[PDB]
Amino acid sequence: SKKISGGSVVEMQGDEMTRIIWELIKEKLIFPYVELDLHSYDLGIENRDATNDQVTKDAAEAIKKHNVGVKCATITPDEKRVEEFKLKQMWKSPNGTIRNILGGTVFREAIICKNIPRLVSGWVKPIIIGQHAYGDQYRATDFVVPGPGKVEITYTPSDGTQKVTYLVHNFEEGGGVAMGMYNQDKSIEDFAHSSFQMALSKGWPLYLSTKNTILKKYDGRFKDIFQEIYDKQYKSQFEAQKIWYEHRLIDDMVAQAMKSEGGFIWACKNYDGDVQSDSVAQGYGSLGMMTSVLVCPDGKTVEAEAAHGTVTRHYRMYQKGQETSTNPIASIFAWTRGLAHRAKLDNNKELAFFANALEEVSIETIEAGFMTKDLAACIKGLPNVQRSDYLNTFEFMDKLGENLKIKLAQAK
Amino acid sequence: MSKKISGGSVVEMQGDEMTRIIWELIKEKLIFPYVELDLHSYDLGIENRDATNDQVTKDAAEAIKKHNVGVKCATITPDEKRVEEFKLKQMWKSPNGTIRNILGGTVFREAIICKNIPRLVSGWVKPIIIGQHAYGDQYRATDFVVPGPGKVEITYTPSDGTQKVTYLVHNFEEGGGVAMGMYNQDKSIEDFAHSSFQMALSKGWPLYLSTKNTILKKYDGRFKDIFQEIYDKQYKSQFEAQKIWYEHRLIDDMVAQAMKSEGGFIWACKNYDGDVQSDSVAQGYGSLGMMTSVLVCPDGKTVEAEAAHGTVTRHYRMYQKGQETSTNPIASIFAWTRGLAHRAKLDNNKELAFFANALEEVSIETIEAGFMTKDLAACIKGLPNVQRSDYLNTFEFMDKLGENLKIKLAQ
Numbered sequence A: 001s002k003k004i005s006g007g008s009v010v011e012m013q014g015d016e017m018t019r020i021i022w023e024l025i026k027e028k029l030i031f032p033y034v035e036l037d038l039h040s041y042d043l044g045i046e047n048r049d050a051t052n053d054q055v056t057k058d059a060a061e062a063i064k065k066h067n068v069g070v071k072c073a074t075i076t077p078d079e080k081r082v083e084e085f086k087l088k089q090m091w092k093s094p095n096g097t098i099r100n101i102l103g104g105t106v107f108r109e110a111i112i113c114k115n116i117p118r119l120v121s122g123w124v125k126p127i128i129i130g131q132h133a134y135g136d137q138y139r140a141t142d143f144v145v146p147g148p149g150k151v152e153i154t155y156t157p158s159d160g161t162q163k164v165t166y167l168v169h170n171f172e173e174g175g176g177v178a179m180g181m182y183n184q185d186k187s188i189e190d191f192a193h194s195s196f197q198m199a200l201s202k203g204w205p206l207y208l209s210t211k212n213t214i215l216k217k218y219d220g221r222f223k224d225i226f227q228e229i230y231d232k233q234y235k236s237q238f239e240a241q242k243i244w245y246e247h248r249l250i251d252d253m254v255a256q257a258m259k260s261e262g263g264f265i266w267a268c269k270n271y272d273g274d275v276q277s278d279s280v281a282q283g284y285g286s287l288g289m290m291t292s293v294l295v296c297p298d299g300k301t302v303e304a305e306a307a308h309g310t311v312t313r314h315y316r317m318y319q320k321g322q323e324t325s326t327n328p329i330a331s332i333f334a335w336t337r338g339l340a341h342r343a344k345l346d347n348n349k350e351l352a353f354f355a356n357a358l359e360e361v362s363i364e365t366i367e368a369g370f371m372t373k374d375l376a377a378c379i380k381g382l383p384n385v386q387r388s389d390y391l392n393t394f395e396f397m398d399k400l401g402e403n404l405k406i407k408l409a410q411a412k
Numbered sequence B: 001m002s003k004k005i006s007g008g009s010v011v012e013m014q015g016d017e018m019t020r021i022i023w024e025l026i027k028e029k030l031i032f033p034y035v036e037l038d039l040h041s042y043d044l045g046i047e048n049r050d051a052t053n054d055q056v057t058k059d060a061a062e063a064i065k066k067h068n069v070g071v072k073c074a075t076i077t078p079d080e081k082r083v084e085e086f087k088l089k090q091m092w093k094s095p096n097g098t099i100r101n102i103l104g105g106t107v108f109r110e111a112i113i114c115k116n117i118p119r120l121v122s123g124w125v126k127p128i129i130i131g132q133h134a135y136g137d138q139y140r141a142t143d144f145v146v147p148g149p150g151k152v153e154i155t156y157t158p159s160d161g162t163q164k165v166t167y168l169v170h171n172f173e174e175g176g177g178v179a180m181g182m183y184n185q186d187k188s189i190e191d192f193a194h195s196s197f198q199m200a201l202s203k204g205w206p207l208y209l210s211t212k213n214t215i216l217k218k219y220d221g222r223f224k225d226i227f228q229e230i231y232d233k234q235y236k237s238q239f240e241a242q243k244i245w246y247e248h249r250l251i252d253d254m255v256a257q258a259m260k261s262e263g264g265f266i267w268a269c270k271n272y273d274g275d276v277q278s279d280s281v282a283q284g285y286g287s288l289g290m291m292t293s294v295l296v297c298p299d300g301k302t303v304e305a306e307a308a309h310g311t312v313t314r315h316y317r318m319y320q321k322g323q324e325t326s327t328n329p330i331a332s333i334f335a336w337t338r339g340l341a342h343r344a345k346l347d348n349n350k351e352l353a354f355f356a357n358a359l360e361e362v363s364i365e366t367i368e369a370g371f372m373t374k375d376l377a378a379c380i381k382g383l384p385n386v387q388r389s390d391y392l393n394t395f396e397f398m399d400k401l402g403e404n405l406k407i408k409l410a411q
């Protein structure tokens, strides 16, 4: 009779074809059933340029205040984009910026449809990657070494005691490159807690990967912190659910994951999580069918995003009124994951039911054979797909909407 | 009369535990009956590395520079438990890391494929060869704990006496943590590029380099720029003539594209990525342990072929108690065959070249005929379904290879 009152959500609008899909999702799938107190931040490239990227920081601050953010894919400028949009600077990726402000762990997991074939034969249960969202390469200082000379890294305590100087390399034959990077104890502790809690929440074992055989001090610190927290705070809960936590060397881990059946949480350092989550998503059948949710250290704030790109080539055709077949699932599940968290915070049973029903309809629709071109290509091979094998962007969104209406009405 | 092949000079690095047992069996049953060698042997077992404060590892690397061919048995890389088990003077670094740091070059890794061993990744009908840059980055880094608030900086002091340059790494104001510095060398990157372009041209396959230059714009940008300059100026015409190409890819794009591909390309990897992704790729072809690993040095004349991965401690303990084991020797065998094949190339030795290939063929044919160790039978049937009649123990398998090798060499 009346729409679900859904509460406060921070929306981060994006670019190009994902921006188009984003507005379709709202128009056809969300707003006909849900009324929201939407706090909207335009992270389009033109508004980021207009505001000297201030809108991105304001959006992150709004997520802290309202505890739920949902983010559309954005352009990370390069030189070509600077020329295309006459940018004032080559602005940094909003995702890096938001993650650095909020902190936490990005959990990434495939979105699985029975008729979309896996590439890895054994993966019959899901693999959830928890990517530490702070530090390491993403805050590093790198530079070109122009010629022979010495590179050192130093630590000067703030409390006035004596410095320590570590030789990096004496460049004796030429130049090269060098870099320093760091991470913080508290961030690592938050990463550990989020990983143990996720594993207990799903009832799956947890592995952390490092390369502490080589980086005995840097990666040893991750290994040590996880083990201490596990022993003192989570081990008895794990044993009660008959699950476990173990550290693994990263190269052992990627091979162990390859040969596994799935069904574990995989805690990754920032870089490894960035890389391995794409490998895993592709192994489940489609790189694009993936959820990506930043879980912040306060245990109450979340940011759900559509991972990967803005699909520029489809946007160019759309702008010319040409037919496209853009997969909206990752954008839809950014909304449903955000709304499901909003519902849990508010004990809003109607919104929780809605968010889960939309995820069900999305998967059921694809499983009934209605699907965009990229998914049909998973089944038949891309050079072999014909027009009758798939739905265009609007046909697919319309089929979702008609299936969502049926699902919500049947439950009433 | 009856004669053996005159094989020439080879540097041998002996190793630890079960791989050491297998190593000696390979020489005794498979190499020495057919090949005479000028063997320059270095004991890289954990006890002798400790006794020499790791000097033997350096001596062995220097011997490879002299004789241009090394073959290496798997070695223990000590952890806390190994330090206690052998009362070590230090948690010594991996010998492979030390040797690679001394020799430099590119480590090429590739699956050893048997028709009856199923892949885990559906589309991989052709091989993926990873060229792992073998020098620098995380494997020569300096890392440390930050015990509390304070400033970490990194500074460059030019040799020529001009003014030093200092960059702020991090101001720790809320606690402690960790930090590290790493580096790489232009000349080493250039050698890595040359080896990668030459390997692609020798195979007739395209070449991809992965980096994360979106994030490390100077450090990884330097890899990208050196590769592109060397390509444009020295190899692009030859690539186009063979209808292949070179392209840079972001590492997270590359791992997904690799997993969705059919194979058939060279994948140039920075040290860390090559270490990690070569294990993923070998496992994806069916068996982590079936892989070749050959360090190709920058001089274009020196190689070190290694048995990659572990020493199979659990089998070694069983062996020490007189219990039956089923230890796969293929990776150790192919270290010898790849080393001898390069030796044959340097010396223009057709007999040695024929032998090295024959041993590889015998190894593959034997497994494809249904004679293998337990690990491989588990690839086919699933470990819970493997019975004794599904496999050969360690000595039965080596003897089967011996008999098939004798037959093959009788043309």
Ligand SMILES: NC(=O)C1=CN([C@@H]2O[C@H](COP(=O)(O)OP(=O)(O)OC[C@H]3O[C@@H](n4cnc5c(N)ncnc54)[C@H](OP(=O)(O)O)[C@@H]3O)[C@@H](O)[C@H]2O)C=C[C@H]1[C@H](CC(=O)O)C(=O)C(=O)O
Binding pocket: A073, A074, A075, A076, A077, A093, A094, A095, A096, A274, A288, A307, A308, A309, A310, A311, A312, A313, A314, A325, A326, A327, A328, A372, A374, B214, B250, B252
């Ligand atoms: N690095 C990326 O990937 C990211 C992309 N961006 C921007 O997005 C724009 C374009 O990016 P691009 O690389 O051009 O990819 P795109 O999204 O166009 O997809 C290529 C082809 O895949 C097919 N395809 C893709 N999606 C769909 C779909 N939904 N439905 C159907 N087909 C699809 C289609 O195929 P076709 O049908 O055309 O044959 C398309 O063309 C640039 O501004 C980037 O900055 C944003 C963030 C990064 C993040 C990290 C970060 O910076 O914060 C990241 O991942 C990393 O770097 O770590």
Ligand SMILES: O=C(O)CCC(=O)C(=O)O
Binding pocket: A213, B077, B094, B095, B096, B097, B307, B308, B309, B310
């Ligand atoms: O070198 C080591 O420490 C173990 C061997 C290894 O990791 C490898 O061969 O890839």
Ligand SMILES: [Ca+2]
Binding pocket: A274, A275, B252
């Ligand atoms: Ca990425």
Ligand SMILES: [Ca+2]
Binding pocket: A251, B275, B276, B279
């Ligand atoms: Ca390794």
Ligand SMILES: [Cl-]
Binding pocket: A322, A323, A324, A325, A392, A393, A394, A395
């Ligand atoms: Cl359309």
Ligand SMILES: [Cl-]
Binding pocket: B323, B324, B325, B326, B393, B394, B395, B396
């Ligand atoms: Cl035996």
